[PDB]
Amino acid sequence: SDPSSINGGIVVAMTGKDCVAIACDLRLGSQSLGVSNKFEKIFHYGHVFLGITGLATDVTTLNEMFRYKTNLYKLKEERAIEPETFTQLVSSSLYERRFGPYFVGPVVAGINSKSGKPFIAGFDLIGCIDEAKDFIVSGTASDQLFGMCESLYEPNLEPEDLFETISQALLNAADRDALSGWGAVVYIIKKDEVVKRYLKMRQD
Amino acid sequence: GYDRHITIFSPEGRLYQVEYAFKATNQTNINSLAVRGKDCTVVISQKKVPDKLLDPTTVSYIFCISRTIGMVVNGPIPDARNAALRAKAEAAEFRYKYGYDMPCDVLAKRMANLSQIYTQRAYMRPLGVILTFVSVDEELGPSIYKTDPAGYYVGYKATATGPKQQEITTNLENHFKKSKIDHINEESWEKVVEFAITHMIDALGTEFSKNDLEVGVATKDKFFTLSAENIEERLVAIAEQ
Amino acid sequence: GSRRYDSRTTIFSPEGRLYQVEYALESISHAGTAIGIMASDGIVLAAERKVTSTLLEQDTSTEKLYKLNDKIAVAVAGLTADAEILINTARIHAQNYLKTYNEDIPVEILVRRLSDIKQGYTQHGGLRPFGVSFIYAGYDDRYGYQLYTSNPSGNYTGWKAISVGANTSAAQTLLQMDYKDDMKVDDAIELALKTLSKTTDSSALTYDRLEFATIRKGANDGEVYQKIFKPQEIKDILVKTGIT
Amino acid sequence: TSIMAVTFKDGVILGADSRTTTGAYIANRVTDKLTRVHDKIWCCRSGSAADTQAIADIVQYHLELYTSQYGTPSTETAASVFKELCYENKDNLTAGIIVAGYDDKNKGEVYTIPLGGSVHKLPYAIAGSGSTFIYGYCDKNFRENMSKEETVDFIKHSLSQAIKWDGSSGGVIRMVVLTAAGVERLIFYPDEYEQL
Amino acid sequence: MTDRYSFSLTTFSPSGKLGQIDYALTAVKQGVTSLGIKATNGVVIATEKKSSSPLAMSETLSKVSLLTPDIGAVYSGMGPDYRVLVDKSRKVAHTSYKRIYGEYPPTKLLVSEVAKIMQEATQSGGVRPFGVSLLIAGHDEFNGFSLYQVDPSGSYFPWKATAIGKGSVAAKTFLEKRWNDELELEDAIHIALLTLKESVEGEFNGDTIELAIIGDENPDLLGYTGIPTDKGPRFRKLTSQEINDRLEAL
Amino acid sequence: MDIILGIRVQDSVILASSKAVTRGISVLKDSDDKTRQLSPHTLMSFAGEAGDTVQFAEYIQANIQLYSIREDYELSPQAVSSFVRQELAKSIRSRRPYQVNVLIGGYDKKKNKPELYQIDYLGTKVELPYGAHGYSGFYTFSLLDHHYRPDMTTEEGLDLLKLCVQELEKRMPMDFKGVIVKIVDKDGIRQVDDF
Amino acid sequence: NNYDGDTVTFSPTGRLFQVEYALEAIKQGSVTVGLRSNTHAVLVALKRNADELSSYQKKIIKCDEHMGLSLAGLAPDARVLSNYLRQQCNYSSLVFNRKLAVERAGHLLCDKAQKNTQSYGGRPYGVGLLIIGYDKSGAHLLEFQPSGNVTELYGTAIGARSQGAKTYLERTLDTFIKIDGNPDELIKAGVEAISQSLRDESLTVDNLSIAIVGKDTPFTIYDGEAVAKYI
Amino acid sequence: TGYDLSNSVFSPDGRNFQVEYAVKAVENGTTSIGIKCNDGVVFAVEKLITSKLLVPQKNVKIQVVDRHIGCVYSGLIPDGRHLVNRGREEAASFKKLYKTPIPIPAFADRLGQYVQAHTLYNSVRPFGVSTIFGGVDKNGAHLYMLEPSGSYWGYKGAATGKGRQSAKAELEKLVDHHPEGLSAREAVKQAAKIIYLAHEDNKEKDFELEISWCSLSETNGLHKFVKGDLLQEAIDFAQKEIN
Amino acid sequence: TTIVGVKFNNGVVIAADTRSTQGPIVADKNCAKLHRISPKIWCAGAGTAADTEAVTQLIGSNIELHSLYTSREPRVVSALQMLKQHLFKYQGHIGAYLIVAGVDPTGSHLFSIHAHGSTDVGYYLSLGSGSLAAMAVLESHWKQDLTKEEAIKLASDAIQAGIWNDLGSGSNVDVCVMEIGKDAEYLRNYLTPNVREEKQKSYKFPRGTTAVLKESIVNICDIQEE
Ligand SMILES: [Cl-]
Ligand SMILES: [Mg+2]
Ligand SMILES: [Mg+2]
Ligand SMILES: [Mg+2]
Ligand SMILES: [Mg+2]
Ligand SMILES: [Mg+2]
Ligand SMILES: [Mg+2]
Structure with a gap:
């Protein structure tokens, strides 16, 4: 009934020293029924990464929408969109559906190509921006993620240390949520290299 | 030669319908003058009642747009009233939307933009009028802003409009060359009206009775027009010195 | 009423021609020459900027060659402002298609869409047509490398090599003479520049009077790269081919 | 809310409390419920604050545009504009407005416009939640052609009782006097009116 | 009533000319000279304040207009057409950009939007083209400083330096000799004043000349303090006094 | 309607769909084919609210056939599935949404690969080796999870499908009157007339 | 001349030529007569045929039980205007239970x-x-x-x-106005009136069309052998 | 040339020839007048009896707007009716919103803006009528006259149509000889005389006189037609003066 | 949320806490609730957070265009009128509750705005879940003719009352001071009385603790040349 918890799933993003990390589970379900273990919730437009939790049809729709919009942006601007700018675009796009919204919990992550500054941001379904320094969480195990992130996180983590922190935050949060899990992916993002890692976790 | 019938460019880059609208401006054969005091803005205009059957109280080209803004028009009365009604509507809408009284210069700009549209859109003709807006603005003080059929507008220290505008303009120019200030250094509006009338008499070379003139005065928080008896008192003071 | 001033832009002449289309084509004939040459391993787009100035900021300037998406580009001949209206519409159509089918738009489908828009202005609405002729250079996985042209009539055709704008009669003869089917991109680059150098109304062909682009599978493995040449890169290829 | 308007010899006086509540919380204890739509045409507002403010603003706009064209409007004309808005939009409004004004020709006039959007011209009017408690008092104590001082006392005593019994009313008693002489604002504090 | 002119008023003649655009350009030619010069650390735009009457207050008539905090515009041709274009340019910078991306548009894209409006008046039903050429100077983070010209047709070109209107041919020749890629902003202002003096007949001072720059951020003009990233507008209109100071070193 | 199953094997996609049509109290038909051929190498099965199912399926069919004629070219299964998803995603926020769930079984002639797409009425698309809609998966997925291999033959896929249908016939309360089975491969679409 | 291209153009003498050209179409149309007394009102119309095989164009149209008209000029325009009258008569009856006044119909x-x-x-x-x-x-x-x-x-x-x-x-004038309570004599005066407009042709049985309305007489049209009485 | 072919086109003079051509239609029409009296207004019109078949007193020309305003016009009669229909809509919406009946000056501008609007576009024709109108409101009596251009002024006396010069001269005498003012009953008599005197310009055909009046004392500020004995008394007075 | 506004001698000050919540969960511990409508017109928002930010940006955008059009600095009454007419049109469905404050050529101003479109005038105001705690402080200590320093003290004390006593409010105090004839000074994190204490333990993991199935380089760069 509740559109934000029919399909399930989670996204978490963290900042580190000259790097950001964004991660998600791979589950798609119809309430109790597990349907797919390959439903990735993180996407990228140039160097800007977007995670989206919530109703899966809207996850797909919004990805296709932001691909559409960042492609036109690039053609006109003659440059790839930046995280700060894309964050405002996501906010604007969600709020234009104020009284008929997409049932999603988006999470932006990336590094500004000019300043080199790590950037993360989160949104509610209606476009309100949460620009946290430390971490952003979203999905059906957001409470669990808040608990994990609040205790595990420390500032200025190196890329390979940040990987361990965000991975453990996601995994243990997902294992306390019925509608999350079935695999996980972690992106480690640096100014000019991005590493993608699939995690081994319990499949129940 | 249909480039002279509608508002499109001639080969010279001219808009003939705009130019002919300027000529309609002088069809009434009336001259108007506007000057600024310290605390006020005065506008005077010739009043001509050629027919004895006319009710002279209804013959007017000065309009009370808002409480603060007054407007004198140079041109035919139907277009004058068209502009007057619109300006009143715009001034009222502005106050409702933005919560404060529409400034004289902002109204002038708005009416100038409307006029500009008639010079660009073919189906709308220009209005054959020149609009002189006056007030005592709460930010800028005494203000004179004038609009024409080209959609042009600008602020004025003083101004004149009509067939004999040049004679009045030069007369005013020469006075401000002497005084070296942007206004009439006078306390009371009564004496600023006396100045306005005196300098129109000098420029045009004609004497005026109380029924030959029409006077509008802008002060802080109100614009008002003078009655024939108020003007008579003004003419008496001029003659007694 | 208003009828008096109506030029009637969408009518036939007694001979069965569309007045405004014909006069728009006359307008395009005075525009800078644009040439497209299709090779087996890529496409070349070469175009001449019209009598420029020394104070024109060339490196940030774009009047001839425009990007529609990552696979398709166009060369413009005619009113630049008119072209940009159409270009933006084409860019949107490509994105609408990509969003719908999750695949890049096939070149012909995009070309047909823009050409249909041009056609509409000649049949209804009472508006003047777009004074623009396009050369479309593009790639898809069905037909591979493709060259098309469209003009204000809304008619489009496919080509191995083609010119639009000024001196197309002279240009098309020169291309027809030296073009071969087994030709390669580097050879096509040379042919394009040689053709412009002979047909130009200017005294000499220089880097500051040119825009240049290549669509190559000369991208690392099975994929396509668009290259809009920079002023210095146009200067280099002019020296390489032996024109300056 | 406790509001009233009373005609007298020299014109009309509007009276009101200053309490605005959200449930049992007093959101504003110094509210001005006496609002100006024209120089000498004012109104008392009761019901939805959003609605009555929106209506009053629209009326003020209409009377300003009226004045630009046709000169000073009558109190009856102002009441008609209020009525038109309240009646035609009755399904989406919760507004109880008393309109009071001073002409030189007609002198002091009072019009009340209840929820339905009907109009009632009266010698005096009372409205708002607190008015219920003073129907008896006002009916017994009102006289026509009172003096300014008598009318001020009548309103002060009336609203004092309305405030005393109605929890939704309170704060200061604001009044606005409309006569040929001009527009006079009056205020009366708790220490003054509670001991009456 | 109804706008019954639903057909184009600009059409191709047999020779391929668009008459109304050419005639609009002729109107621009009659207009007062304005110019723009781009430096390494700024851009300058300038024009003459041709006062229609000495009784008129020429300060109230702004030929040089702020479009965004980092973009300014000047024109040659019909003033009223310019004034409405500035209104539309200001609004479109918000509606089609700032309300979407939360930041002001880059110079080239705002120019593109202005160009589109001018193109539409060249093709749409029942209208004439705008009788103005615009010079738009601006700055943005990724493109740096830039200067663009926009014509009645809707065509726009980027310039290192240029001039439009009355004495544009002579002025452009003057700018070609003086311009180089190592100019500082003060040097460009100096060249601008020299160039503009040639096309001016009468009085040449800070009260008869309008001049603005796109340069360094002005935190004194921001109106508030507390946000480090907000450093103030790059557009600044030079005062009457500031112009006269540089006319002594002329 | 009720049960629709799909399985992608080595070189083909197999769709099994129930034959029953029940209007409340009575089974009005026991030979209903809940599928439409969208293109020569693309088949779509469907289940959902009465009327909407066939209306939607035929609307999609018409659109794909229109595309086929215009371009003289068959769209890839992926392209068809994306088109279908968008229509359903558009539908869910309409005045009256299409209450239709579909499986799209196609053979991509370019890649030489079978492809099965599962899309529900919300526009929730997933590419799967095997899929179902409604309660069908609850009974069958445990069997498919156990036995399925990506290198299965068409004959082995049919055997695993029979086991799924047998489990449905045993534990489901509703009599769905058996299934019509169709195979989608490089040679096109054919029906298994004995099942 | 230059001012007759459309109805929106006054001539230099203040004339509307398109209206005058429309007026000309009436003069080309077949003759029809109207007259009344204090009790009855009568329409008499000379119908026009295309040729001997053709029917005679109907000239009279009923608008209500108490009202109707006869036409001269473009028949389709009369159909539009009569339809409009039918609606207005009908609106008055349905909404106000009131027969539409003839003056208000005009x-x-x-x-x-x-x-x-x-x-x-x-x-x-x-x-x-x-x-x-x-x-x-x-x-x-x-x-x-x-x-x-x-x-x-x-x-x-x-x-x-x-x-x-x-x-x-x-x-x-002074005679036929006094024909009160005598429908036949009032029609006779109308038939005698329209006879003054005939040349070459005369009033035959399928040529003549008569209509009458009065105090206790609904609007009724007479054609064919019903008007042979008056020939 | 060609400036006079389309409405709303400025000639090189700055004139709108189409409006001036509409005036010619007005000048071609029958004579109509208006007289402002002490506590009201009187309207009168010349009705040309084209034939004996015209029913006397039936083809009424003067029209009432609301209950306090009278309107009369010369020129194209249908155009006048169209203008009055609009006037009635204007007066109805004014009273709907503001309660009070529309003041005469307010009403005058409503017609004025509407007529002026028909000089702004080539898709409409100017009004082929000059309209004399007025009545009694809260500020007393008012008489107006409105031309095809949209131009209107307040009047002591007004006249238009073919015999306007004759009428105007007669009105000017009344203004001079009665500075203190004219009574309503006097104005009715004078109105009858003036129409009879102005009939010399239309002397070929005989005519029918029609008079109406609004007066604070005589009609309670409501518009009424002059009928029966009062009308005959005015006709007798008029017939006595011409002989 | 706790937001307050306080008038003083030569201007006005607004303040706010920095806690944004999702039900009982704290989403952001240092949210910026003080929004800019124009350089010298600032507002603080409570209720639906997206609506407060969205409505201030829209009116702020139109205010900027209006300022450019009229060649005049924006007025608080204009922001007030535009906000209330927008909110009234949407009948409370836009859940924006604002305290608007600023200086302009007319003077210094302080208003509150409710979601249904009603507005109020005052010398001291409070909004949000901690408004009652804040108003208690304001009613206890407010006086006429406050200085700049006294108003900042009072405003921040009122926010503190919300921070400590209201569960919906917490973390830090933001302040903005708008004085006549001066630039408005935004004081981000004016007070910081809620810094988290050092944890008992470091939860930095040994590298290689997480089990990994696959690694790969993601191509963020464009299609390459040659
Ligand atoms: Cl505007
Ligand atoms: Mg789980
Ligand atoms: Mg499980
Ligand atoms: Mg025009
Ligand atoms: Mg409500
Ligand atoms: Mg109480
Ligand atoms: Mg699904």
């Missing part, structure tokens, strides 16, 4: 025709109408021109050669 026709003379794109109506009716103020006869001018009259005639019938009625 005012409505005037205003409808007027809008076609002041707006671009349209054209004036190319027909003239003679409206008869019996309402709360007795018998009435109106003459409608597509310029918009509607005129209440004792008697009149419009169409080709209508001047002859109009002069006759102008002489007979």
